[PDB]
Amino acid sequence: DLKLPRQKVELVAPPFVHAHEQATKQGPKIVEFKLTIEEKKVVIDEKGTTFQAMTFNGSMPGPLMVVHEGDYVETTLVNPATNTMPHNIDFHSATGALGGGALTLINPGEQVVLRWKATKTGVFVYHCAPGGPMIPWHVVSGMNGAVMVLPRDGLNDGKGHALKYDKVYYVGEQDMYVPRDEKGNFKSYDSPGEAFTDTEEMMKKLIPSHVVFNGKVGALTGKNALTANVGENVLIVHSQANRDSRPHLIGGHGDYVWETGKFGNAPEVGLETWFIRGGSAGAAMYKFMQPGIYAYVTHNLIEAADLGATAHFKVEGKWNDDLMTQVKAPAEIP
Amino acid sequence: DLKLPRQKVELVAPPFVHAHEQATKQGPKIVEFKLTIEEKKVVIDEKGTTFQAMTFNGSMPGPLMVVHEGDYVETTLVNPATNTMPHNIDFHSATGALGGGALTLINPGEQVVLRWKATKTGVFVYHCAPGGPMIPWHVVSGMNGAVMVLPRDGLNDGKGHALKYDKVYYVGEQDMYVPRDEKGNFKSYDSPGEAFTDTEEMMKKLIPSHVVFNGKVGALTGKNALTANVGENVLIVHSQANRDSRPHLIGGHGDYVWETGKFGNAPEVGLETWFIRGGSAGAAMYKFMQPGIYAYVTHNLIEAADLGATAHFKVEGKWNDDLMTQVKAPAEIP
Amino acid sequence: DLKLPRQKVELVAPPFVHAHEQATKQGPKIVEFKLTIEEKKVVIDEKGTTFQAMTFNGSMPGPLMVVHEGDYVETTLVNPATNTMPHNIDFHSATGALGGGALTLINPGEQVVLRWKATKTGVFVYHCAPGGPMIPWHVVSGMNGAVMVLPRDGLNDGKGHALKYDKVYYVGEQDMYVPRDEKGNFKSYDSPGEAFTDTEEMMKKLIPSHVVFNGKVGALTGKNALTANVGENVLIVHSQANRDSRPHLIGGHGDYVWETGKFGNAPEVGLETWFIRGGSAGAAMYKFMQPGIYAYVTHNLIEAADLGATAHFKVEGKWNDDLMTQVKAPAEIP
Numbered sequence A, B, C: 001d002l003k004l005p006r007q008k009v010e011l012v013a014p015p016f017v018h019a020h021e022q023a024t025k026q027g028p029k030i031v032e033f034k035l036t037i038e039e040k041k042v043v044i045d046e047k048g049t050t051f052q053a054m055t056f057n058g059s060m061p062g063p064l065m066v067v068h069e070g071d072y073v074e075t076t077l078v079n080p081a082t083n084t085m086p087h088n089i090d091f092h093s094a095t096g097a098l099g100g101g102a103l104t105l106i107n108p109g110e111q112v113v114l115r116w117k118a119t120k121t122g123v124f125v126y127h128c129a130p131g132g133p134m135i136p137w138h139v140v141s142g143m144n145g146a147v148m149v150l151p152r153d154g155l156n157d158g159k160g161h162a163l164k165y166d167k168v169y170y171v172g173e174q175d176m177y178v179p180r181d182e183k184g185n186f187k188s189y190d191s192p193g194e195a196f197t198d199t200e201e202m203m204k205k206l207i208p209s210h211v212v213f214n215g216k217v218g219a220l221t222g223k224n225a226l227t228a229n230v231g232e233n234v235l236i237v238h239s240q241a242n243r244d245s246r247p248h249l250i251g252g253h254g255d256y257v258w259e260t261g262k263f264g265n266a267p268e269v270g271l272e273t274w275f276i277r278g279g280s281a282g283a284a285m286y287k288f289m290q291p292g293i294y295a296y297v298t299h300n301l302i303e304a305a306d307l308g309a310t311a312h313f314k315v316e317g318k319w320n321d322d323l324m325t326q327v328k329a330p331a332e333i334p
């Protein structure tokens, strides 16, 4: 019926992204992906707070899927019998049936296969959306990720010049709502079902207890810091499925930024801080000019420093004293 | 003095918009509108919660006024003796006197006539603004709507091509602050005056109890769903007079979006989610490609699913399997 | 080593800005600035509420520094022995070492000299960032300001036409977190250290007690209103180092707006309300067309009217009845 070549993709866990071409001479293909839902209790902070998570492929965020404009994305969604709830998937990149959600509702023990054509370029959120009050709950429990649909000629600056990245990372930000008991300690639950009543009362007050990248406080730091070298052009894809974020690379800039995340629009240049609308993904690229540590944060600094929303980059290379120099080191006031 | 032709407009209740031309060969006219203030107790949710509303023309939002660049808008504002408070009107589209507010303060029993020239194209908020602490209270009680000022040549994509809509809807989003008693039930009041003290304490904490389109949970659903057909280009005008919103059409896109709402700027293309700044209106147009149900939401999903901010479209036409198809229906895992 | 001419600047307190050229025939210079940190208890509202402030040069916000693209900015930061905490400075305009913060940490009694090259045009935040949980606390205590880096040819509209302002004001917005005691009154503290524990618990709940321009409720009103005349083009630079804002000039517009604040991007035109992302500065220019009072607010009106975020302009000149007129004054309903 639809007679195109098929290509399988092996998804990798964020913040890494599966191998792909930017500009390509391939024509349209059916690109095949598989997502398996996992409900699990996880640790979200350095004090040992636990959380009833619901995930695609066992990670928060779900993995980034990368295709090109005109491809057909065929996803097998699997809800094993070890889960307790029905789940589905909705792609903001897709057209019709509530983004696919109306065609993908599966009980524990079932799977479904959905195909959608990638007619719109950019980065887009996907998330679970089973219906009614379950929709927010599933999403803030971790069931969201993103897809990137590239132009076949790769990215451009709007002003006919190509924009090629040397690497891409995917930072998924997650607002989490963990209730406290009378003592003021965070509560733990035996199942997602049991967490629901207390969690929903807290959610409706709209203030998260934690805001984290890659599912945990400190996930993208120390040994798991993002890396680059001076001279490298890095693309950072940032998603937030429920709540606004304001990304900022401390010590750097957004050289080229698509804050609404859609490549039919020219990027903005030379930003300090950009804005990711809740329910969207955006993308920023920067060429590193200096070595050392950078922090990538949401620039509500309370959220960054106290609620979990800080990642690090470690950058190698030579210090440029023309760009910045300590003229005189700390010394007593004359 | 000002010797131009006069044209009366009969306003219609949102989400409908009074009949108007897009591109027009008419020159400037004085366009005449009348707004009558109504204070009333209304029901805002399916559990029967009540609210002391203050409205233009008896609706939340007030009706959309549509004119063209260079027109003169002459508004008669009427505050009948059955109301209890002074009221006025401020147009963000207008220049001078706090948008008209400083020239339109009227006690119960009075009316006033204001004229302003429409020098700026786009969609703009209007709202009551009597002075001091009353300003937020009147606005979050429902006294806000919007005006659309069209270019005389109609809308364009910035890239010399015309953008004609087949229909336009106006979705006004309202953040509401209903206090709870010691039990945890929503309180009811006999008058706006009596609601004021409890309402103001809640407002200053910045978290709404409800966020609704067209004045009530479920207002734009079921029999009152928005409608379209595959192939129709629909313009959705969205306003929020006090608090940010992030509109999203589930299963669709914003083909052409003016998120800051001003037609001197080219629209952005192919958005998933857009951002309406508190105190502004924006506009998005989409051509439907698939039939079925779509939800139009703010993509803070807690607000959408739990606080009231969801509308529906029912779209007629033929399903397009090239864009999306269920390859295999729900089935047991092999 | 770096052999360029040196120029000293005398900083002035906001909302004024030190004298500078827009378009300039000067080449790159080393521009020298000095900032002295002051910790002090201040009054932030008309009821006499006090607050433990931490400031650059004794003001909230810190003063605006103005330079041109390609200049080298050399800042002497001074932390006198009368202060109690270590401090530093981070410039969003600068490249490397966490914006300078990693090179400027000074204990009470010390000073440091940092030089950075201004490679990026626009308005940018600077703020203290000592490390960890101290970062948000220092910033919301008042330790933030902004810098403007102008193109050497001055500003343009993107469409080759020059945009010259007759004056510029700097409005720094500050979200403040003052705890309440059991009575419900605001608490006072003897030192910043003692304020810390209660302040941090409140901060993590993300709702400010006050939102103020220029450090106090009513600071930019009455005798300290901003001024202009009909026909004057005024540039308003607005910063928020931690939390989003949505500026709006009541009775006017943003004729040309850089809401992300970066002059490599063309401005948007004819805005009603614009958006300043937390951790950024933006800039709007407007030519006054009418005399009288204007209010400049964040258009969350609860914040504007009840939490402190309102400034005034008093504009002189002749009223234009073509733009707006009271056709009929308040009168009894026929």
Ligand SMILES: OC[C@H]1O[C@@](CO)(O[C@H]2O[C@H](CO)[C@@H](O)[C@H](O)[C@H]2O)[C@@H](O)[C@@H]1O
Pocket: A151, A156, A157, A158, A159, A160, A263, A264, A265, A266, A267
């Ligand atoms: O970056 C997108 C932006 O650039 C323009 C040229 O200003 O178009 C380039 O990008 C388009 C999308 O990739 C190409 O189709 C086009 O051929 C190319 O010039 C704008 O039209 C667009 O908004």
Ligand SMILES: OC[C@H]1O[C@@](CO)(O[C@H]2O[C@H](CO)[C@@H](O)[C@H](O)[C@H]2O)[C@@H](O)[C@@H]1O
Pocket: B151, B156, B157, B158, B159, B160, B263, B264, B265, B266, B267
């Ligand atoms: O969509 C507005 C955008 O388009 C441009 C052309 O890129 O101007 C078209 O729209 C203007 C406003 O309607 C017209 O006056 C103009 O003649 C037409 O080309 C841009 O200038 C504008 O920002």
Ligand SMILES: OC[C@H]1O[C@@](CO)(O[C@H]2O[C@H](CO)[C@@H](O)[C@H](O)[C@H]2O)[C@@H](O)[C@@H]1O
Pocket: C151, C156, C157, C158, C159, C160, C263, C264, C265, C266, C267
């Ligand atoms: O306003 C910036 C915007 O204008 C353009 C022309 O559309 O470039 C003008 O501004 C640049 C930055 O000041 C100049 O370097 C350029 O020479 C001038 O045309 C755009 O390129 C830019 O995004």
Ligand SMILES: O=N[O-]
Pocket: A040
């Ligand atoms: O399931 N945990 O690795």
Ligand SMILES: O=N[O-]
Pocket: A180, A181, A182, A183
């Ligand atoms: O302590 N239990 O809510």
Ligand SMILES: O=N[O-]
Pocket: B040
């Ligand atoms: O006044 N109610 O229809």
Ligand SMILES: O=N[O-]
Pocket: B180, B181, B182, B183
């Ligand atoms: O129950 N009254 O606040």
Ligand SMILES: O=N[O-]
Pocket: C040
């Ligand atoms: O230190 N006060 O002016």
Ligand SMILES: O=N[O-]
Pocket: C180, C181, C182, C183
């Ligand atoms: O009243 N003291 O928290």
Ligand SMILES: [Cu+2]
Pocket: A054, A086, A087, A088, A128, A129, A130, A138, A143
């Ligand atoms: Cu789910």
Ligand SMILES: [Cu+2]
Pocket: A090, A092, A125, A127, A279, B299
């Ligand atoms: Cu969604």
Ligand SMILES: [Cu+2]
Pocket: B054, B086, B087, B088, B128, B129, B130, B138, B143
């Ligand atoms: Cu009113």
Ligand SMILES: [Cu+2]
Pocket: B090, B092, B125, B127, B279, C248, C299
């Ligand atoms: Cu307003």
Ligand SMILES: [Cu+2]
Pocket: C054, C086, C087, C088, C128, C129, C130, C138, C143
């Ligand atoms: Cu400090």
Ligand SMILES: [Cu+2]
Pocket: A248, A299, C090, C092, C125, C127, C279
């Ligand atoms: Cu910063």
